[PDB]
Each structure stands twice: as C-alpha cells, then as structure tokens.
Design a protein around this ligand. Structure first.
Ligand code: MG
Ligand code: MG
Ligand code: MG
Ligand code: MG
Ligand code: MG
Ligand code: MG
Ligand code: MG
Ligand code: MG
Ligand code: MG
Lengths: 106, 151, 110, 209, 59
RNA sequence: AAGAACACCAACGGCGAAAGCACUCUGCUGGGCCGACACUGACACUGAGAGACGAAAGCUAGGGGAGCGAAUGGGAUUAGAUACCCCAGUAGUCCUAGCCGUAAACGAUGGAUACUAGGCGCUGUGCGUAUCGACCCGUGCAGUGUUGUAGCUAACGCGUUAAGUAUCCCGCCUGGGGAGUACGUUCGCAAGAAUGAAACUCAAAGGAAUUGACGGGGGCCCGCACAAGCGGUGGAGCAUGUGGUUU
C-alpha cells in the first residue's frame, strides 16, 4: 500500500474496468514487498487484427524502481489484454522475490 | 583506479613564508576557482593570530595540524562477515590533508564576522586543545579503540 | 598453573595451583567484550593480561599453561603470558581425544 | 629399448636381449638395406627428387650435410603442418620467400623506418628457419625419408595420405605398418645414423650417374 | 593426559616460541582432527576426506 | 556410576555370494589360493517352481537408554517460515527373541567355458637365480587396480576382470502418460510387499555429443563502475518539454 501507479495509453484508450484489473494483479505481487517500492510504471499497447496487419497482439510493459537502487524490466506479449497483464505480474513476483533472497542471504 | 600508480603532484609553496603546508591549506578554502581572495582571508588571519598571541603564526599552524592529525581511522568492510568496521592506519600525506578538511569544515560552520575571523579563532582554539575539529578527532579515535578488535 | 580454554565464541583463562584450587580467573566476557568480539585474538590478550597481572603481584613466578581446544586467541594469549615477568616449564595442551566415543551433531546446512 | 618400452610389434624382428637394454636383429634388416638401396639406386636413375626429414638435435647438422652431397632436400627444423598436403599454401610462402631474397638486394631498406625494417628482417629470418632446404624443389617429391618417427609424427602421416613410399624408424619405439620400407636400429647414436644415412645417401650418388 | 610438550625455560625471542609450538602441534594434527570430530561425517565423507589427504601428501 | 562407539595403524589394502565384516584376545566353525608323486574316472554347466540369507526404517513382547536425534515446543531469520539457523528434546538409535523382505540392494553391466598385443604395481602361494640369513632380481598360478592395441559401440566409453570373438542355460524390454494405479488373489499382527490391466489421451517422451546463452559456479581483466574528492538534482520560485485532464 501507499504506492503510486502510472498507466499509459500507447496505442489505445485506457478503460476503467481495465484499470481495475491492473491494480488487482500488481497489487498482489507488490503487496508482499510493499515496503521496498514507491511507484509502479505500466505501458499497455495493442497491435494487429483490425488495427494493423498480422495477428492481434497486446503488449504490457512494466518497469519498477524500488527504494534501494533496484531496477526491473518486464515485457511480454499475448493475444489478449488481460492475459498479457497476468504473465507480466508473474515475472515481477519472480524477480521481486529474487531480490529479497539476495538481501536476506546473510 | 585499477592502475594503482597515481602520479605524484608537484607540492608548491607560497611566496612569502616559502612552505608547502600553507599552500595545501589554501587550496581547500576556495570553491569557485579564485586564489587572490583566499590570501585576503589568510593573510588577514595569520596577522590576526599574531595580533592576539604575540608569536609567530607558523608554529601555531604547525601545532594545530600536529594535534588534529589522528593518524588512524575506521573503514567499513563486508568481504568477510556482515557490517564490520575495523581500524586502519593513515600515512603522512593523507593525514595532513585530512586535518585541513576538518579545520576549514568547522570554521565555516561556527559563527563569526568573516572567514578570516572564523579561521583565526579556529586555529587558535584548535591549538589550545579545545576545538570543534579536535572533537571529531576524539570521535574518530573513539571508534578505532572502541572496535579495536578486528570485528 | 594457568588453564586456558580456547574457542570460536569465547576464551576462558583460569589460574590455579598444582593441587587444583583456583585463585583468580577472567575471560573475554568479563573484560567487556560480547558476541563475536570475544573469539577475536585481541580479546584473548586483554583477557589474559587482567587474569595474570594480579597473579604476578602475589609471587609465584613459576607457572604452567594448559591449553584446551582450538581458537584464534590461543596463540595470541601466549604473547600476553610471555609478555610478563614470569617463567614457565610446560606449554602442553590438555585437549580431549575421544576414540570414537559418542555421536557428534549433524552437519550444518547454511 | 627396455622392458617398459618394448613394443610387441617388432617381435618378428627381435633375436635376443640382455640386462635391461634391448638387442635388435641385424639379419632381417640387411635384406631391407638391399631392397632399400636397390629401390633408391633404381629411382635416382630416372631423375626423381627426394626428401629427408631430420629434426632431432643430435642429428640436426648431419642431415643438413647429408643433403649437400646429392640434389635432394632436407627439413632441419619442425614440420609446421601441411608442408606437402597443403602445398598450395607452401608455394605461396616459397614464392614469397624466394622474392624476399631479391627484395633485400634493392636499396629500399633505406626508405623504410627502423621498426619496419626489423619486421621484414625477422619475417625473413623466421622463414629461413623452416624453409631452408626446399628453395630448389619446385614440385612434390616422389620418395620421402624419415629420420625420426616420434618427433616428426606429423610428416609420416601426410605421406600416407598423399600415397608416397617412405623409410621409417622401425626400432621398438614405433609401428612398422606405416612405411613399406623398413630399416630398424637408428635410435642408438650418430653411429647408427651416419652408418645408415651415409650408406643410403651414397647409393643416391651412383644412381644419379 | 597431554598431547604435546615444550620444556622451554627462556626463549631467545618472544615470537619464536610459536615456531616450536605451532609446527609441533601441526605434525600432531590437533586442529584438523577437532574440526573433524565436531560434526558427524558419513562413510562417503570419510572416503573423500582420506582420499584428498593422500593426494595432498603423495603429490 | 552408566551407556554407546573404537582415533592413530588406514590404502592404489584384505575376506565374504551379496547385504556387509576394523579396539583386543580365546573357543567352535565355513570358504578360497597354491604345491604335488594318493586317488575318482565327465560324477559338468545353468536353473522354471521352491527354499535360505538379506542395509536402514518400521512393527510385536521383555530389558536398557550416556550422547546424538523424526515428531512436538520455544527463541530468531522472514510479507509469511507448519523450513534452512539456534536452545531444549519423545519414539527410535543399543541387547535378546521373532515379524516385515524393501533400497542409486550400482560395476546402473546375470552365470559357466575357450580364444584374443602390451605398459605400470597390490596382495596371496610356489619355482629358480642370488648374499643361497631373510631381502633384492627373474618367472608360474589364482586374484585385485590403472593406462592402452586390435575389435566393438549412436556416441561417451568398454578393452584378457570386455561393453571384443564364440557356445550353453535363466530372467527381462517392445512409444509416452494413465500406472506399478484399479479389481481379484497369496503372504504379513499391522504398515505394506509380490502378481498386474483397461477405458480415455498425446505425436511425442528419451539417449549421447556440439554450439551459444545463463549461473546468488570458478579464475583473470577493464570503464568516473564503486570508493575518495568537488559541485548539483530531488525542496523554493521561474524557463521549457511529455503525460493526463480539458477543448
Ligand atoms: Mg526363480
Ligand atoms: Mg533397524
Ligand atoms: Mg527393487
Ligand atoms: Mg551397498
Ligand atoms: Mg537393477
Ligand atoms: Mg546383479
Ligand atoms: Mg582402457
Ligand atoms: Mg545431455
Ligand atoms: Mg562515489
């Protein structure tokens, strides 16, 4: 809790039901190490189908800057928007847990 | 750096007193790249020290560096174990410049009319035991003897 | 006699006569150290000095040191005992030697 | 050579043995000395070019002088790979090496700097170390002689690859199946070398006519 | 019940006593055997240990 | 006073069908090797069923219980810690009767026999030379290890102790998952062991080796990478860009 959030309509408009789905996922992965991070960067995109040529694909780029010189870069691609958000959140929880295991190595 | 062979700089001396200690003392005063103003801060100070003490200011300056110089310090290390601060000795040149920072550092902090007065009262007080820079020597020297064991 | 027990967490120094009746003692903990600083070799020097200094005043120039166990302070304690005003005959180490007697603990994982 | 060094391959060509040391057979080789000198004498009459491969320190200069008596070729230093097999690269280095001796005659060394002249000096010096006895070959030999099998193991294999008969070191160190012509007893000393080397080099002289 | 003895009475130096004490106890191997007997070791560790000791002494 | 276990000797080591057997002796007792001039006269090999032995763990009674230690508590590390760490600690670990009959019970390699280059050194027991005091040296036999030729092998590697060349006999496999599961049967005090499917489902699963990438693997080195120093940003006010909202 007490962490800001940044969305970005790269190639589309950000709806409200989508915004609720974003906060639900990263809210789980970040609530664990909530006292290490201050902000959450997000950038949603869309391509293909009716917009462009090729398969419909929606990207979700997520960057995270902790309170102690921590940098995370996560980028995945899926056929739907929610599925893209889900896969990235799993990657953040993996690397975000990797940091504590190194700090708590003793 | 990774070379380990730093060139030895040409330690110069002032025109009047012709000693290299004074020139090392001046180079820490300026911060915008001007030397003509530091002497107006210095030559007014050493004259003011002579006005008060009735003796050469050179010995008073040589005594202050002799008293504030700790010749020992503590550095943090965690190559073995977590959060260790064991002592470490200091050379002759390193301890010399190390005392200049503490003197001029305390002079800027303490109140006064000008840097010449703030610097004059610092050296005169620092030479006579009681000085804000001498307190930092005691604090740094305390941490060494406190953590005298290598742990 | 000067029984000394070395270890990684502490170093003990007990003085006693040949008959086995202690007169004085002091360890790194009594000196002021605590935690991991006790096992350091410097603590053995200061701990040994405070225990033997009172003994040199009360005569008994003769002495025998009985080392017991490993540690970093066992060698540093000799410098403390040697840097003194007493002679010595034995520098023997009365350590245990089990011939496969009991079961030791399990190995540590961390 | 010894109880811990005798190869079971030479067992047909062993007669007896002694305290530690080994005794080679001089009977079977005498037939091959005749077959060798008969083939070398017959081959030299047709005008072929031969080669000798000697790099052992004890017989480095002996093989050098051995080649001056005839119009054959020697290899004093190491084999450096692909001498005969990669002949296309060898002609490039020999055409190169042949030219540099003409380069030194010109007065172009004056207009070169100090360091550049040193590289050209050390360049030609390196090729002289390995390309000395080949300067007048101009082609591939037809028979190649091996003085040492162990130290020059690479030279014996390119002959088998290119299909060239050869002479070998059939003493107990090596394998006799590698060369068709077999002459043991050459690892003893220069006596075993010069007695055989001068004998075979001698036969080349009358064969040359 | 002892393991090592040094009957010095007046050494020529303060630090040279360790030369007579360390190397003497080293040949007896008191430090290595106590580290061994601290934690239990299986038959696998014994074979690996004694094998490394031999390879260290042989060459 | 008690219980349990035997440093050093100790390995490139010995014995045993394996599992396994190491502080010392003594008793009873099994097996192997060699020698030779007593003898037997193919009385051999393998082995379905069956039978015996069979690490630890665990079970059924009776004893014992020092130390160590599942479980269970407590103190810490952690977002959490029913874990790793630390302090205490039950069953069990030990003995005598018996059950259980499973392990990476591995040399991941069934047994017997004949043939097939060598090099090193370790035992056991002979022969001969020799100092004939043993030793040493040289060889035979039966074993035990390490390199390695031919040959085999997908490759790694095996290689006179074969994973080579051949014969005889037993067991065993026929894509993966479902599954060593379900039903039934036999044994077992139980825990569970052995025997052992099908429906349905995928077009793979898997082996060796190569190349990169990666590693809280190792070694070395470099950059204002850190450290050290000097001066700023983040706060204030105002330039000016982007988002967002608004239009
Ligand atoms: Mg059966
Ligand atoms: Mg049991
Ligand atoms: Mg099984
Ligand atoms: Mg086993
Ligand atoms: Mg099996
Ligand atoms: Mg088997
Ligand atoms: Mg092999
Ligand atoms: Mg593989
Ligand atoms: Mg820095």
């Amino acid at each position: 809790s007490s962490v800001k959030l940044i969305l970005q309509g790269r190639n589309l408009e950000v709806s409200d039901n989508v915004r609720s789905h974003v906060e639900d996922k990263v809210g789980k992965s970040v609530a664990k190490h909530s006292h290490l991070v201050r902000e959450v960067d997000v950038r949603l995109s869309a391509r293909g189908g009716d917009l462009s040529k090729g398969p419909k694909l929606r990207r979700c780029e997520v960057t995270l800057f902790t309170k102690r010189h921590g940098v995370i870069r996560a980028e995945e691609d899926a056929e739907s928007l929610y599925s893209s958000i889900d896969l990235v959140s799993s990657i953040i929880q993996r690397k975000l847990r990797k940091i504590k295991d190194k700090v708590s190595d003793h | 750096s990774r070379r380990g062979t730093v060139e030895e700089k040409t330690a110069k001396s002032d025109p009047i007193y012709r000693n290299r200690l004074v020139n090392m003392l001046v180079n820490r005063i300026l911060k915008h790249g001007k030397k003509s103003l530091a002497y107006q801060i210095l030559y007014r100070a050493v004259k003011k020290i002579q006005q008060k003490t009735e003796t050469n200011p050179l010995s008073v300056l040589r005594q202050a560096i002799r008293g504030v110089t700790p010749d020992i310090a503590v550095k943090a290390r965690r190559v073995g174990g977590s959060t260790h601060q064991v002592p470490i000795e200091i050379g002759s040149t390193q301890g010399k410049a190390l005392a200049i920072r503490w003197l001029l550092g305390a002079a800027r902090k303490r109140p006064g009319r000008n840097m010449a007065f703030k610097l004059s009262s610092e050296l005169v007080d620092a030479a006579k035991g009681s000085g804000d820079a001498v307190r930092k020597k005691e604090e740094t020297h305390r941490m060494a003897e406190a953590n005298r064991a290598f742990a | 006699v000067i029984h000394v027990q070395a270890s990684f967490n502490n170093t003990i120094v007990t003085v006693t006569d040949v008959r086995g009746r202690v007169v004085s003692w002091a360890s790194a903990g009594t000196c002021g150290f605590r935690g991991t600083k006790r096992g350091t070799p410097f603590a053995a020097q200061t701990a040994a000095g405070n225990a033997i200094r009172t003994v040199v005043e009360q005569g008994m120039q003769r002495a025998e040191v009985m080392i017991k166990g490993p540690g970093l302070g066992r060698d540093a304690a000799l410098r403390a005992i040697r840097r003194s005003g007493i002679l010595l005959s034995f520098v023997r180490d009365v350590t245990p030697m089990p011939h496969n007697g009991c079961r030791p603990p399990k190995k540590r994982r961390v | 050579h010894g109880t811990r060094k005798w190869n079971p391959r030479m067992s047909p060509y062993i007669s007896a043995k002694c305290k530690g040391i080994h005794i080679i057979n001089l009977t079977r080789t005498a037939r091959f000395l005749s077959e060798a000198c008969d083939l070398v004498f017959d081959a030299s009459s047709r005008g072929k070019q031969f080669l000798i491969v000697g790099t052992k320190n004890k017989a480095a200069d002996s093989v050098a002088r051995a080649a001056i008596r005839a119009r054959c070729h020697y290899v004093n230093k190491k084999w450096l790979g692909g001498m005969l097999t990669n002949w296309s690269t060898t002609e490039t280095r020999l055409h190169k090496f042949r030219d540099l001796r003409m380069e030194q005659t010109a007065g172009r060394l004056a207009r070169l700097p100090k360091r550049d002249a040193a590289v050209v000096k050390r360049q030609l010096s390196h090729l002289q170390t390995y390309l000395g006895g080949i300067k007048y070959m101009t082609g591939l030999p037809d028979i190649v002689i091996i003085v040492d099998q162990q130290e020059e193991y690479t030279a014996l294999r390119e002959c088998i690859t290119l299909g060239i008969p050869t002479i070998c070191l059939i003493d107990t160190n090596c394998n006799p199946d590698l060369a068709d012509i077999s002459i043991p007893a050459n690892d003893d000393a220069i006596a075993s070398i010069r007695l055989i080397l001068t004998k075979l080099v001698f036969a080349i002289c009358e064969g040359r006519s | 019940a002892y393991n090592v003895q040094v009957l010095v009475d007046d050494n020529e130096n303060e630090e040279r006593l360790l030369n007579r004490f360390r190397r003497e106890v080293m040949r007896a191997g008191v430090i290595q055997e106590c580290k061994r007997r601290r934690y239990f070791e299986n038959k696998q560790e014994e074979k690996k240990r004694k094998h490394r000791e031999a390879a260290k002494r042989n060459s």
